[PDB]
Structure 1
Amino acid sequence: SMFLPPPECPVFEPSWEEFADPFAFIHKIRPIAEQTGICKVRPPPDWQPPFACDVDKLHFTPRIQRLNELEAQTRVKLRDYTLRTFGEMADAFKSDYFNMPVHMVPTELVEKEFWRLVSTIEEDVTVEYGADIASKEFGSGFPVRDGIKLSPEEEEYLDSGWNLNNMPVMEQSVLAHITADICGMKLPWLYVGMCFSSFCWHIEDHWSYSINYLHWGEPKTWYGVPGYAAEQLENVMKKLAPELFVSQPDLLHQLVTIMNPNTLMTHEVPVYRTNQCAGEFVITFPRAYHSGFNQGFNFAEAVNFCTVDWLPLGRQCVEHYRLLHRYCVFSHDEMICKMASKADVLDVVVASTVQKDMAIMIEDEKALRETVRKLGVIDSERMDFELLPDDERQCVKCKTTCFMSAISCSCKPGLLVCLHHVKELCSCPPYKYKLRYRYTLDDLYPMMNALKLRAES
């Protein structure tokens, strides 16, 4: 009645042995957690990263949020509070809203109340929050390196796999090997919460994993949907709020919304919940929709990552983006080829999985090139796509980031289409077209062979 909490998501308590390697651990829980989309990970009791900061010297620009269900909000873009003044505002808000000591409101009640107030148009509650990548004004909650002497305890956690700053540059996240500037994806985001500040339903760019660590404060309440129910959820969303689905003019205009999990559960979409408390991790799996809100003043840090498991999903995702005409954050094929070009220094399990994705890439590329030849495109020239800014190598039709090949035409200088959209570039006859390609098929097979040798198969 009014609000029925979804079932709880898995909670894992790894021993220090299991916890040592995050990628091994994530792989182990994967068959369980991917059925629920999110899961929680409680570190061993003696895993306490040192959090220390001056609350008066950390400052940030607050973002403002209206709280209406099904109302469109924009995904956060890449006034001023200090952490102390925000904290004071946030505690006062919650304390005044409930007329209770700010830390005495039951989590059950805030949740019930959150879903009441987002559904009631008579109640125009607005809240504020912080969201940004680390900077000089507000840095990572985890120990980093620079011109400040670290204690032996901080040095212990400097190189932890669970220090989210390390997640990008680690040798089991294929995002590490990307040389392209994708700071939005590789760098951790910092989130300063207050009561009811919320993140709308979304999945991660390129269907990556995400991992969220609650450093300090009141809990963060989560809802998660498993990857297999993604399109099921999207169907429901289109039905009740189709306005969210009109084509986005940019990646800076992605529309997302708050929507009651009971509404989803009513339409047979599986939904799980959890309250993430301070010192706990939440992990989201590929294409797992998730949303949530903060119980009160808190501080979280989150980062994207991609394991070898993800590679085939990454390819499927870029295909899905093409159908939707959605912009890519990076070129997936460019990443695969970058890794192939470094086959000798690759982890051997990585090499093996990259090899299989590369084989699919090459076979798809072979067929596409045969098709455009049959359309009468004859002229061709090698082109170093990776040197072009992304906005200079998107298919004018489906907006995909080109890398393996594209079609150009002297009639339309600087414009390109991917090989799926040869007809869409201009009205000139195809013999005026040019296939621009990064590699010949003859360059590609040896790159794939290097992977095979490194995989030792």
Structure 2
Amino acid sequence: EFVPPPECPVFEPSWEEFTDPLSFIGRIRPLAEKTGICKIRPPKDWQPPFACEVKSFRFTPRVQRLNELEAMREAFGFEQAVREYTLQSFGEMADNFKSDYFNMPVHMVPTELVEKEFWRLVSSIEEDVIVEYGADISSKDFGSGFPVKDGRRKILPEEEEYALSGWNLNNMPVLEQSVLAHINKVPWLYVGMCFSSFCWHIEDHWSYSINYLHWGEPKTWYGVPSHAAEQLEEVMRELAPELFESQPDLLHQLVTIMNPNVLMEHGVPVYRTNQCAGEFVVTFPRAYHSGFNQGYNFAEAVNFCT
């Protein structure tokens, strides 16, 4: 059965340390860049409101067959009837799925059991589990989960500090320095359910990324430090399907699912974490990462530059 990787670093900044994100990330870099990912727990009283337009939040999530790679059928291409949800109806679907799957209330399922079952299902040819992921929804569509002082939605006085906070993902620096910048980006949202997942990838331009879980059940992460990027890529090339081996990285990353224990057996260092509601995850430049959701949740993410 699955062997959990060692835990990545978790930081609990004081209010003083919590003042500036880029200063804080710069200070923790000597350790966190050696693990690829780290988790940051804000001070206990730092609790931003949830500011999305919930009434109108509608989306068509994408369908994920956990074992699609292992399975490489009559009338393939039509495996699933298409479904549009609201935030509420997706959550009802997500909770019903998980409680039915495990035969217990959703919050009673141990995170280690969901993790073991996820990786079993990914390699299982005997059972096809299909889930849905509201992934990569633009914060321009229904707003960011953070309050934003753009005049589209009311901000209460006690919420203004969150609209102005440097840890608000809309206030992260995103402009890369370049000559072209002198001659010539917003956060993205992820509505998760149990087993919905993201496969191994790095960011465009080897960017940092930061990720905030607004609410819901945890998001389970795996990260690889940048010093092992080429090692991971070599294991991928050895073990990825031959048909996808020659593909450019930007396309291969759509289907680079791989059990962390396989990477660890080939000597790749892997760290894990459960990101809980109200916690940040930072990924460092060229740090490969992947993960899955434990249940119904809502995350926001952006690439930033230093």
Q: Same fold (TM over 0.5)?
A: yes
Q: Any gaps of 5 or more consecutive residues in structure 1?
A: 73-78, 181-185, 308-457
Conserved in 2, the CA contact under 8 Å of 1:70 and 1:257?
no
Amino acid at match of 2:243: E
User: With structure 1 as the length reference, what TM-score do the two structures score?
Assistant: 0.60
1:174 and 2:176 correspond: yes
Amino acid at match of 2:110: P
State the secondary structure of the residue aligned to 2:16.
Answer: helix
Instruction: Name the counterpart of 1:335.
Output: none
In the alignment, the residues of structure 2 paired with residue 39 and residue 253 of structure 1 have an alpha-carbon distance, to the nearest angstrom, of 25
In the alignment, the residues of structure 1 paired with residue 179 and residue 11 of structure 2 have an alpha-carbon distance, to the nearest angstrom, of 29
Instruction: Name the counterpart of 2:273.
Output: 274
Instruction: Name the counterpart of 2:216.
Output: 217
In the alignment, the residues of structure 1 paired with residue 300 and residue 294 of structure 2 have an alpha-carbon distance, to the nearest angstrom, of 16
Conserved in 2, the CA contact under 8 Å of 1:127 and 1:197?
yes
Instruction: Name the counterpart of 2:25.
Output: 26
Instruction: Name the counterpart of 2:122.
Output: 118
- Equivalent of 1:152 in 157, 181, 187: 157
Amino acid at match of 1:114: F
1:99 and 2:103 correspond: yes
Instruction: Name the counterpart of 1:142.
Output: 146
1:164 and 2:164 correspond: no
Instruction: Name the counterpart of 1:294.
Output: 293
Instruction: Name the counterpart of 1:68.
Output: 67
1:236 and 2:241 correspond: no
In the alignment, the residues of structure 1 paired with residue 42 and residue 118 of structure 2 have an alpha-carbon distance, to the nearest angstrom, of 29
State the secondary structure of the residue aligned to 1:263.
Answer: helix
Instruction: Name the counterpart of 1:386.
Output: none
How many aligned residue pairs are there? 291
- Cα 1:251–1:108 change in 2 (3 A) is closer
- Cα 1:268–1:225 change in 2 (3 A) is same
Query: Which 10-residue stretch deviates more, 60-69 or 233-242?
Result: 60-69
State the secondary structure of the residue aligned to 2:195.
Answer: coil
Instruction: Name the counterpart of 1:201.
Output: 200
Q: Any gaps of 5 or more consecutive residues in structure 2?
A: 72-82
Q: CA deviation at 1:70?
A: 4.7
In the alignment, the residues of structure 2 paired with residue 123 and residue 82 of structure 1 have an alpha-carbon distance, to the nearest angstrom, of 29
State the secondary structure of the residue aligned to 1:162.
Answer: coil
- Cα 1:269–1:70 change in 2 (3 A) is farther
User: With structure 2 as the length reference, what TM-score do the two structures score?
Assistant: 0.89
Conserved in 2, the CA contact under 8 Å of 1:50 and 1:153?
no
Matches for 1:15-54 after TM superposition, within 5 Å: 15-53=14-52
In the alignment, the residues of structure 2 paired with residue 60 and residue 67 of structure 1 have an alpha-carbon distance, to the nearest angstrom, of 21
Larger Rg: 1
Instruction: Name the counterpart of 1:324.
Output: none
Conserved in 1, the CA contact under 8 Å of 2:207 and 2:284?
yes
Identity of aligned residues (%): 79
Instruction: Name the counterpart of 2:246.
Output: 246
**Cα distance per residue 1:318-341 (max 9 Å; x no partner):** xxxxxxxxxxxxxxxxxxxxxxxx
1:82 and 2:86 correspond: yes
- Cα 1:110–1:51 change in 2 (3 A) is same
State the secondary structure of the residue aligned to 2:212.
Answer: strand
1:262 and 2:275 correspond: no
In the alignment, the residues of structure 1 paired with residue 139 and residue 20 of structure 2 have an alpha-carbon distance, to the nearest angstrom, of 25
- Cα 1:261–1:139 change in 2 (3 A) is same
Conserved in 2, the CA contact under 8 Å of 1:214 and 1:279?
yes
Instruction: Name the counterpart of 2:75.
Output: none
Instruction: Name the counterpart of 2:133.
Output: 129
In the alignment, the residues of structure 1 paired with residue 51 and residue 15 of structure 2 have an alpha-carbon distance, to the nearest angstrom, of 24
Conserved in 2, the CA contact under 8 Å of 1:69 and 1:258?
no
Amino acid at match of 1:146: G
Instruction: Name the counterpart of 2:77.
Output: none
In the alignment, the residues of structure 2 paired with residue 69 and residue 197 of structure 1 have an alpha-carbon distance, to the nearest angstrom, of 13
Conserved in 1, the CA contact under 8 Å of 2:53 and 2:143?
no
Q: CA deviation at 1:43?
A: 0.5
